[PDB]
Design a protein around this ligand. Structure first.
Ligand SMILES: [Cu+2]
Length: 123
C-alpha cells in the first residue's frame, strides 16, 4: 500500500511540517514524500529507527519513495528544518517496541512538542 506525505512550509501545526506527521504502515508498504514547497527532504534520525533498518536520506526537493521493511517506529526529519520541528513518525506493525525509547530520546524542544501531539492526537 502507498501513503503520500506532503513537505510544506506551513500547515495545520505551524511552519515546516510533514502532512501527515503520523504514518501507519505495514512491512512492504511505501511512503512517498512529495516536495509541495521547495527546501525540504527526509532523513532518518540516528538511533530513532528500528534495529536492522537501513538509514536513509533524500536530496532536497526530490520526490522520495521509502520502502519500509522492519517493524517498529521511525522518527524522520527534514534535515534543514529539524530544529524548527519538521518531523514525522512512521509506525510499522502493531505495538512498536522502540516507541517509548524514541519519545524519551534527546531532541529539540519543539520536536518533542510536536511528537507528543502526533502520538496523543494523530494516533
Ligand atoms: Cu524542511
Amino acid at each position: 500500500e502507498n501513503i503520500e506525505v506532503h513537505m510544506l512550509n506551513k500547515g495545520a501545526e505551524g511552519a515546516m511540517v510533514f502532512e501527515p506527521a503520523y504514518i501507519k504502515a505495514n512491512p512492504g508498504d511505501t511512503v512517498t514524500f512529495i516536495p509541495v514547497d521547495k527546501g525540504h527532504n527526509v532523513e532518518s534520525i540516528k538511533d530513532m529507527i528500528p534495529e536492522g533498518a537501513e538509514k536513509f536520506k533524500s536530496k532536497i526537493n526530490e520526490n522520495y519513495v521509502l520502502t519500509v521493511t522492519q517493524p517498529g517506529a521511525y522518527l524522520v526529519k527534514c534535515t534543514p528544518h529539524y530544529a524548527m520541528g519538521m518531523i514525522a513518525l512512521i509506525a510499522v506493525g502493531d505495538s512498536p517496541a522502540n516507541l517509548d525509547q524514541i519519545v524519551s530520546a534527546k531532541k529539540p524542544k519543539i520536536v518533542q512538542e510536536r511528537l507528543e501531539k502526533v502520538i496523543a492526537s494523530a494516533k
